[PDB]
Amino acid sequence: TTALVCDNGSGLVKAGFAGDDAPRAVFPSIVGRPRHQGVMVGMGQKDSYVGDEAQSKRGILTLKYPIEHGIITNWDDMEKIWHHTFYNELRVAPEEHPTLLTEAPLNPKANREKMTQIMFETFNVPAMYVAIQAVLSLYASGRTTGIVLDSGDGVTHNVPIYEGYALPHAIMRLDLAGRDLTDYLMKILTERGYSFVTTAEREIVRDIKEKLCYVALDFENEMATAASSSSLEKSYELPDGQVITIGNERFRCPETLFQPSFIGMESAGIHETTYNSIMKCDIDIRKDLYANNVMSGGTTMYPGIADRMQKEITALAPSTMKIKIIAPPERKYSVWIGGSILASLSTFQQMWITKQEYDEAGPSIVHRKCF
Amino acid sequence: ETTALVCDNGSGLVKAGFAGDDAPRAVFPSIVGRPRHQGVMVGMGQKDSYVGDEAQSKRGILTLKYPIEHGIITNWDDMEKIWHHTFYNELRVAPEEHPTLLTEAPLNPKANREKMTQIMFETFNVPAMYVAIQAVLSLYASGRTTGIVLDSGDGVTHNVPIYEGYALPHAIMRLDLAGRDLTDYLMKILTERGYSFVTTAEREIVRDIKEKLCYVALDFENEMATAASSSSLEKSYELPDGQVITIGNERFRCPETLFQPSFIGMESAGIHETTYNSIMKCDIDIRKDLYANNVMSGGTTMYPGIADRMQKEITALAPSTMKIKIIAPPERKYSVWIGGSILASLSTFQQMWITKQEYDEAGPSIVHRKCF
Amino acid sequence: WXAXCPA
Amino acid sequence: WXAXCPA
Amino acid sequence: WXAXCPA
Amino acid sequence: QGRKVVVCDNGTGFVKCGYAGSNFPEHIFPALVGRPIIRSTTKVGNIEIKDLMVGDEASELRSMLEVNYPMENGIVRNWDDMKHLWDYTFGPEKLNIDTRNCKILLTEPPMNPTKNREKIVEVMFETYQFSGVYVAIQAVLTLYAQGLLTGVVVDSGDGVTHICPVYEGFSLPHLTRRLDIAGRDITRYLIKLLLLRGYAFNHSADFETVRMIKEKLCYVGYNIEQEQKLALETTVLVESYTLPDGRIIKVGGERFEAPEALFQPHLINVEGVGVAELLFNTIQAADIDTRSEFYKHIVLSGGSTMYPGLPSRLERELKQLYLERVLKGDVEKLSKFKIRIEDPPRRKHMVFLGGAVLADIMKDKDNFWMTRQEYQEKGVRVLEK
Ligand SMILES: Nc1ncnc2c1ncn2[C@@H]1O[C@H](COP(=O)(O)OP(=O)(O)O)[C@@H](O)[C@H]1O
Ligand SMILES: Nc1ncnc2c1ncn2[C@@H]1O[C@H](COP(=O)(O)OP(=O)(O)O)[C@@H](O)[C@H]1O
Ligand SMILES: Nc1ncnc2c1ncn2[C@@H]1O[C@H](COP(=O)(O)OP(=O)(O)O)[C@@H](O)[C@H]1O
Ligand SMILES: [Mg+2]
Ligand SMILES: [Mg+2]
Ligand SMILES: [Mg+2]
C-alpha cells in the first residue's frame, strides 16, 4: 500500500512511511562496541551497541561513523544499522513494502552496485530505487528551477536545474562538511584552554556547535568587537557541571565554509563554487538560476547564513538584477519530504526496479537508471 | 644582430629558441605559482613567486594557475613574469640584442594583440617583432602550400583552409574545446571509477596519466562491448605515493569527447564535422586539393589511431569516389616553432618586421593592418 | 573572454 | 576514497 | 589544563 | 643588550640553560621543588637545609623533602612555584646574568593555550625586566641542528607528545595532533604494575626513585607476541637495581610492557590510535607530493624516545600500515619502499643546539625580538608568528 524512504545521511538517518509529513525515525548513524574487557555477565551486555542507544552509553564505547564524507567504509556497520532501523524501530518487514534510497552525486559506482546487491539479496525487497537528495529537495520545495545547496554533514554539492531538465556537466562536490567544522572547532577550543579528543567529547562539541554557533556578516568587524569582549561571550553547561565560556569561536568555525584555507584545503568557498557552477551554465538560464536558490541540509541552519550568501553573491554578480535567497524553516527533512512525494507520484509506480529484471540483467542496471 | 628568437605562447606550454636551430632550447609549462601556506623557518626569504619547472617540482605547496585560458590572456602580470623568466634565466639573451617573434590563435580579440605589442615595445624595448598564426607556420614547417590545418592545441582548436599563395579568412572555425576540457572530463570520470582528484597538483598528475595511457577507439560501441569483457584492456599506473590505479574504459572514453562534444554538454560539433563544414564552405575546385592535403598539428592530436579515425569519418561523410589522405608527421608538437624559425630565416621577411620608430609614430593599431 | 565564456 | 582523501 | 585533563 | 644571550627550555620535567654558540649545554638541572619534611619512619637531619630548595640538590636530598612538580603537559598550575624556580635559576649561583641587559630564547610547546605565553612574557617583562625575549617552535629548534628544511617531528617528552611536519620549510599547521601520553605516564604505569608485584609505593619521592630503574631496565620490544612468549617461557630477562636503602626488587616482566602504552594507549584509559598509526594517518591526510618526502626524512626527537628499540618498532609498524592499507598485502611492490629515521646521538638535548645556532646569526639585527619598549603600549602582543 505504501513505500519506505530511507536517507543514509552522512551523520544521521531519516526514515518513515510514504505519505507522512514528518519522519517516524530520526537517530544518528553510530555503531559502537565496548572498549573494556567485557567483564559483566548479568542483565544486559551486547557485543555491539549500535544505534540510538549508543548515544546514551557513549562513555564506554568507541563510536565510529560507518559513512565517511558520503562514501561507505564499513559494510557490516551499514547492514547492522539497516537491520536495526527496519526491525527494531520501523517493525516492518522488507517484503511488505519497497524501499527508497538516496545518495550524493559523483559517488563511485561500486557503492551503488554493492548497496543494490545487498538490498536485493539479504532483505529480498520487492523493489527499490536510487535517487539524488537535491532533486528531492526541489520536489519538496515545489519548484522546477533553481540551484541546490545540499550542505550535509559529510558532503556539500550543487546541481543546477532548469524546467524539465538538469545540467550534469555543471555539478560540483565539496568534501568540506560538518565533520571538518567540528574538528576545527575542537582545535580552536584547544587554543582557548579546553581539550576534547575522544568521540564522546566529539558529540559534546557537536551539540555545542549546534546550540551556540552563528555566522558573521563581516569578519573583521566581528573580530574588532571581540577585542571589546564584554557582550559576545556565552556560557555552556557541560554534563559534569563545568562551565565553558565561548567567544570568537562562535563565528570563527562557520567562516571556514567561506574560507577553506583555514583548514589548509586549496579550494574555494560555497559562494565561489556556486558562482562558478552558475557561470558554466547557459546565459539565458543564469537569470532563472539567480532568481531561485534553494538550500538544504543540516549545515545551513546557522542564523545569518542566508544574508551573508546573498551579500556575497550580489557583490560577485553584476549589480543590475535582483538576487533572492529562499530559506525554508524545515530544510533539515526536505530530502525525506521530497522522497515521500516522489514515491506518492502515480507515474513513479512503474519506474521501480524489481527482483526479476535485476536478476536477469544484473547490478549494472541501476547505473543506467536515471544516471 | 645575427638571428632572431621565436616564442610560442602555447595555452599550456611555452616553446622558445634561436632562429635556425631544428629543436627548441627551452620547453617548460606556463605555470605561475605562489605559496599557499604561512611559512615558519627563518633561513629563507625565497621567491614569493614561482615559475617554470621549479613550480612543477614543488607544486605540492603552491596554488598553480595558468596565465592563459583558452587562448586569451587573463593575468598580464603572470605573462610578463614568464616572459622575463624565459628571456633572462633560461635564454640569457637581452631583448635588445635580437628581435622576437610571437604567435597567437586566430579570431583573437584585438585588445590582447595591442596590449602585447605595447608591453613588448615599452618594457623590453625590443628592436623589432612580428605577430603571426600557428597554422601558417605549420604549413611552412610541413613544406607545403595547400591543405587544411588542424591546430588542436591545449587551449584552442582551429582550422584555416589555404590555397596556393592565398588563404580563405571567411572559412575559419575556432573551437574552445581543447586539452583542458579533456582533463576535466577525465577527472570527472576518474571520480566515477573511485579515484578522486581536485587540486592542481592532481590536475598535473591526471594530465601526465592522459599523456601516457590514452588512445582513441576506431569504434565506440565495439570498444565498450570488449570492455564488458574486461580482461585484456585494463592498465595500471604508479602514483608518486606508490598507490596503483587501474584504468579501463577511461582510456578511450575521454578522447571521444572530441568527436562527441555532447558529453561535456557543449552544443557544437566534432572536429570532423567542423572540418567538413569548413571545406564545404570553400570553392568547389579547391575542395579536391584540400581533401588531398590535410595537415594536423598540436599536442592534442598525438593519440594513436586518431589519424585513422579521422580518415574513416571524413571518407564516410565525403563522397566515396575520390581518395582522402591524412598526413601525421611524428614531430607535430614543435611544428609551429619550426615554421616560425624557417619564416624568420627567410630573406624576404627581414623587411616585414615592425620597428620602434614606425610603431611610435603610428601607434599600436599598426599591427592590426599587418597581415590581419 | 571578457563577455561570453570565461577567458 | 581509495586514492585522494580517506573515504 | 583548565577543562579536560589536570594541567 | 650587552651581546649576551642565554637559551632556555622551561619545559615540564627538566630545565636546560646555556649560552649561544655552545656545542653542549653548560648546566643541566631538573624541575624539582619541595618544602622540608620530617618522616617519623626513619632518618633524621644530617646536613644543612633551607625552607625552599630546588635544582640538582633535590635529586640527591629528596629523602627529607616533599618533592612536587610545578609543570606537566606544558601548562601552568602554580604561578608561585614557577616564579620561585625562575628566581633560583636566575640567581647568582645557577646562571648569574644581568636581567636589565640580557636577551633570552624560549621554546614553548606547540598547540598550547595563549594564556601561558602571555603570563610568562608578562612575568619576564615585569618581575625581572628583561630587555627582550622570543618564543620559538620546536620544529626550527630541531631541524636547524643538522640542516634539514623538510621533515616530520615526533618530539616526545614529559607532558604530551606533539608533531609538526614541515615540507620545503613552509609550515603545515593543519597537520599537527596531540596525544595524552608521555614519560610521566609510563611512570604511573610501571608503578601500578610493580604494585601488583607486591610493593607499596607513595607519590612523594619514590616517583623520582623509579626514574633510574626505568632508565636502566625498561626497554621496548620488536614483536609483542614473541617477547610475551619469551617472558612466559623463560626467566632470563629478569633484572634488578640497588635501591638507596639497600632493598632489592625483582622486575622481569613489568620492564617490557610499560613502553607498549605508547603504541597501545588503551592500556592507560586513552582512546588513542598509536604513534605509528597517528603518523601514517597524518601523512596520508596531506597532499601527495609531500608524502614521499615526509616518509624519506623523519626525526625522533625528545629524551623520552631514547628507549632502546623504538626505531625498529616504529619502522616495522609503518611498513605494516603501508602494506595493509595501500597494497593490500602485495609484498612484492613493498620492497623498494625506504625509510631512514633520523636519530642523532645527541637526542638528549637538541633544542638547545638549535637555539644556540639561531642566536649565532640572529643576534646582530635587532628586528627579531619583542623589545622592552613595545610592552609599555596597548594593543600589543602577537608581535610575530
Ligand atoms: N541546529 C543545527 N545547527 C547547526 N548545525 C546543525 C544543526 N543540526 C544539525 N546540524 C549539523 O548538520 C548535520 C546534520 O547532518 P546533515 O547535515 O542533515 O547531513 P545530511 O544532509 O546528508 O542528512 C550535523 O552534522 C550537524 O553538525
Ligand atoms: N605526449 C602527449 N600525449 C597526449 N597529449 C599530450 C602529450 N603532450 C602534450 N599533450 C597534450 O598537448 C597539450 C600541449 O600541447 P601544446 O601544443 O603545447 O598546447 P598549445 O597548442 O597551446 O602550445 C597538453 O595540454 C597535453 O594535454
Ligand atoms: N632514558 C629515559 N627513559 C625513559 N624516559 C626518559 C628517559 N630520559 C627522559 N626520559 C623521560 O623524558 C622526560 C623528559 O624528557 P625531556 O624531553 O628532556 O623534557 P624536556 O622536553 O623539558 O627537554 C622525563 O620526564 C623522563 O621521564
Ligand atoms: Mg545529505
Ligand atoms: Mg600551441
Ligand atoms: Mg625539552
F199: domain CATH number is 3.90.640.10
* Å between F262 CA and nearest CA of chain B: 27
> Which residue is associated with the grid cell 619545559?
F11
Burial class (CB in 10 A: 0-12, 13-18, 19+), F331: exposed
B32-44 core/surface letters (b: 16 or more CB in 10 A; e: else)? bbebbbebbbeee
Which of A169, A276, A282 is best to mutate for the B interface (most B CBs within 10 A)? A169
Which residues have C-beta within 8 Å of that of residue F97, sequence separation ≥ 6?
F4, F6, F90
CA A266 to ligand 1 center in whole angstroms: 24
Residues that constitute the known binding site of F: 157-159, 211-215, 302-307
- Within 8 A of D6 by CB-CB distance, chain A residues are 68-69
CATH of B136-182+272-334, one of 3.50.50.60, 3.30.420.40, 3.30.70.1230, 3.30.70.260: 3.30.420.40
What is the grid cell recorded at B245? Answer: 590505479
Residue range(s) of every CATH 3.30.420.40 domain in chain A: 1-27+69-134+334-367, 135-181+271-333
Residues of B in contact with D1 (CB under 8 A): 194-196
Interior angle at CA B296, CA B295 and CA B297, nearest 5: 130
- CA diameter of chain E: 9
Contact A63, A30 (CB under 8 A): yes
| F264, burial (CB in 10 Å: exposed 0-12, middle 13-18, buried 19+) | middle
**CB-count exposure of residue A340 (10 Å: 0-12, 13-18, 19+):** buried
Residue A234 cell numbers, joined: 556565552
For residue F384, the CA-to-ligand 2 centroid distance in Å is 45
For residue B98, give the amino acid letter.
Answer: H
CA of D6 to nearest chain F CA: how many angstroms apart? Answer: 7
Scanning chain B, the segments in alpha helix (DSSP H) are 53-57, 76-85, 110-122, 134-142, 179-193, 200-212, 220-228, 250-253, 256-259, 271-280, 284-292, 306-317, 335-345, 356-362, 366-369
Residue identifier of the C-alpha nearest atom 10 of ligand 2? B299
Does the distance separating the beta carbons of B195 and D5 come in below 8 Å?
A: no
Beta-strand (E) ranges in chain A? 4-8, 12-17, 25-28, 67-68, 71-72, 99-103, 127-132, 147-151, 156-158, 161-162, 165-166, 172-174, 234-237, 243-246, 293-296, 353-354
Q: Whose CA is nearest to atom 14 of ligand 1?
A: A298
Put simply, whether E2 touches A (Cβ < 8 Å) is: yes
Q: What stretch(es) of chain B map to CATH 3.30.420.40?
A: 2-28+70-135+335-368, 136-182+272-334
**B151, β-bridge pairs:** B158, B297
Closest CB from F144, F173, F292 relative to B241: F292
Instruction: Give, in order, the Cα–Cα distances in Å from A27 to each of A13, A46, A51, A53, A211.
Output: 6, 19, 7, 9, 18
Could you please state the CATH topology (level 3) that the domain comprising B29-69 is classified under. Actin; Chain A, domain 2 (2.30.36)
Three-state secondary-structure class, residue B74: coil
Residue identified by cell 618522616 is: F39
What is the rounded CA–CA span in Å between residue A26 and residue A330?
Answer: 14
- Interface residue E7 vs chain A (CB under 8 A): no
Residue C4 with chain B: CB contacts under 8 Å: none
Distance between CA B178 and CA B151 in Å, rounded? Answer: 10
Residue among B302, B304, B12 at smallest CA distance from B156: B12
CA atoms within 13 A on the CB side of A22: 3
Neighbour-count burial of B327, counting CB atoms closer than 10 A to its CB (0-12 exposed, 13-18 middle, 19+ buried): middle
Instruction: Give the DSSP letter of residue A87.
Output: I
Compute the distance from residue B245 Cα to the ligand 6 centre, in Å.
44
Provide the CATH topology of domain A28-68.
Actin; Chain A, domain 2 (2.30.36)
Mutate to test the interface with D, among A71, A153, A155 (most CBs of D within 10 A): A71
CATH superfamily of the A1-27+69-134+334-367 domain:
ATPase, nucleotide binding domain (3.30.420.40)
Domain B2-28+70-135+335-368 belongs to what topology?
A: Nucleotidyltransferase; domain 5 (3.30.420)
CA distance B128 to B6: 12
Which listed ligand is nearest to F10 at the C-alpha?
Answer: 3
CA of A354 to the centre of ligand 3 (A): 66
Distance in angstroms (rounded) separating the CA atoms of residues F131 and F128: 9
Q: How far is B338 from chain A (nearest CA, A)?
A: 37
User: How far apart are alpha carbons A337 and B350 in whole angstroms?
Assistant: 75
| Binding site membership of B95 for ligand 2 (Cβ less than 6 Å) | no
Q: Which three cell numbers stand for residue F183?
A: 614519560
- Binding site feature residues of F for ATP: 157-159, 211-215, 302-307
Assigned C-alpha cell, B62: 603552491
DSSP state letters, A233-300: -EEEE-TTS-EEEESTHHHHSTHHHH-GGGTT--S--HHHHHHHHHHTS-HHHHHHHHH-EEEESTTS
Nearest alpha carbon, ligand 2 atom 16: B299
Number of separate helices (H) and strands (E) present in chain E: 0, 0
**In this structure, which residues have their CB less than 5 angstroms from ion ligand 4?**
A 9, 133, 152
State the CB neighbour count (10 A cutoff) for residue B355. 13
CA–centroid distance for F174 within its chain: 22
Q: Phi and psi for B133 in degrees, rounded to 5?
A: -120, 140
Query: B12 CB under 6 A from ligand 2?
Result: yes
- Helix, strand, coil percentages in chain B from 3-state DSSP, rounded to 5: 40, 20, 40
State the Cα–Cα distance between residues F64 and B56, nearest whole angstrom: 66
- Number of other CB atoms surrounding residue B244 within 10 Å: 14
Looking at chain A, the domain(s) classified CATH 3.90.640.10 span: 182-270
Contact of B218 with B308, CB cutoff 8 Å: yes
What is the number of H-type helices and E-type strands within chain F? 13, 16
The answer to whether residues A325 and A293 touch, using CB atoms and an 8 Å cutoff, is yes
B35 → closest Cβ in F140, F170, F322: F170
* Chain D neighbors of A175, CB-CB under 8 A: 5
Angle between helices A305-316 and A270-279 in degrees, nearest 10 = 50
The per-residue b/e assignment along A295-325, b for 16 or more CB within 10 angstroms, e otherwise, is bbbbbbbbeebbebbbebbeeeeeeeeebeb
Q: Are B120 and B27 in contact (CB under 8 A)?
A: no
Q: How far is B181 from chain D (nearest CA, A)?
A: 21
Closest C-alpha to F288, from B196, A181, B14, B159: B196
Going by DSSP bridges, is the β-strand pair F75-76/F71-72 parallel, antiparallel, or unpaired?
antiparallel
CATH topology of domain A135-181+271-333: Nucleotidyltransferase; domain 5 (3.30.420)
Task: Measure Cα distances from A157 to B299, F157, F287 in Å.
Answer: 34, 44, 22
Position B251: which residue type? Answer: R
Q: What is the dihedral of CA F259, F262, F268, F270, to 10 degrees?
A: 180
Quick one: fold of A182-270? Actin; Chain A, domain 4 (3.90.640)
Helix (H) or strand (E) holding E6: none
Cell numbers at A368, concatenated: 543506467
Evaluate: CB of F9 within 6 angstroms of ligand 3: yes
| Beta-carbon-side half-sphere exposure of residue B177 (alpha carbons within 13 Å) | 26
Return d(Cα A93, Cα A211) in angstroms, integer: 37
CA distances from residue C3 to C6, C7, F68, F124, F259 in whole angstroms, order as listed:
8, 9, 73, 61, 67
Residue range(s) defining the domain that contains residue F199: 183-263
Backbone angles phi, psi at A147, to 5 degrees: -125, 135
Chain B residues with beta carbon closer than 8 angstroms to that of D4:
195-198, 202
Chains in contact with B, where contact requires at least 3 CB pairs less than 8 Å apart: A, C, D, F
Tell me whether strands F65-68 and F132-133 are parallel, antiparallel or unpaired: unpaired
Q: How far is F212 from chain A (nearest CA, A)?
A: 32
Helix locations, A130-218, DSSP H: 133-141, 178-192, 199-211
**Neighbours of D (≥3 Cβ pairs closer than 8 A)?**
A, B, F
Q: Where are the beta strands (DSSP E) in chain F?
A: 5-10, 14-19, 27-30, 33-36, 53-54, 65-68, 71-72, 75-76, 103-105, 132-133, 152-153, 166-167, 170-171, 297-299, 340-342, 370-371
Closest residue in chain D to residue A67, using alpha carbons only: D7
State whether the beta carbon of F183 lies less than 6 angstroms from ligand 3: yes
Torsion of CA B368, B370, B372, C5, to 10 degrees: -40
The amino acid occupying position F180 is D
CA-based nearest residue to A149, from A167, A166, A133: A133
- Contacts of residue B321, Cβ cutoff 8 Å, sequence gap at least 6: none
Method of determination? cryo-EM
Sign of the torsion angle spanned by Cα atoms F45, F48, F50, F54: negative
Q: In this structure, which residue's CA is closest to atom 11 in ligand 3?
A: F304
Q: What is the dihedral of CA B95, B98, B99, B100, to 10 degrees?
A: -70
Query: Among the atoms of ligand 2, which is closest to the Cα of residue B154?
Result: 19
Query: What would the grid cell of residue A181 be?
Result: 567544522
Could you give the dihedral angle defined by the CA atoms of residues A265, A269, A272 and A276, in that order, rounded to the nearest 10 degrees?
60
Residue A28, SS3?
strand
Distance CA B100, CA B102 (A): 7
Q: How many beta-carbon pairs under 8 angstroms link A with E?
A: 16
Element of type H or E holding A355? helix A355-361
Smallest CA separation from ligand 2 atom 3, residue: B211
Q: Which of F312, F308, F292, F306 is nearest to F344 (CA)?
A: F306
**What's the rounded Cα separation, in Å, for the pair B36 and B217?**
41
For the record, the C-alpha cell of A18 comes out as: 510514504
The answer to whether the CB of F152 falls within 8 A of the CB of F283 is: yes
Final resolution, Å: 3.9
- Is the beta carbon of F259 within 6 A of some atom in ligand 3? no
Residue F161 DSSP class: B
Residues in chain A: 371
Q: Which ligand is nearest to the CA of B155?
A: 2
Question: Which H or E run includes B51?
Answer: strand B50-51
Say which CATH superfamily domain B183-271 falls into: ATPase, substrate binding domain, subdomain 4 (3.90.640.10)
Nearest Cα neighbor of B201 from F352, F289, F382, A338 is F289
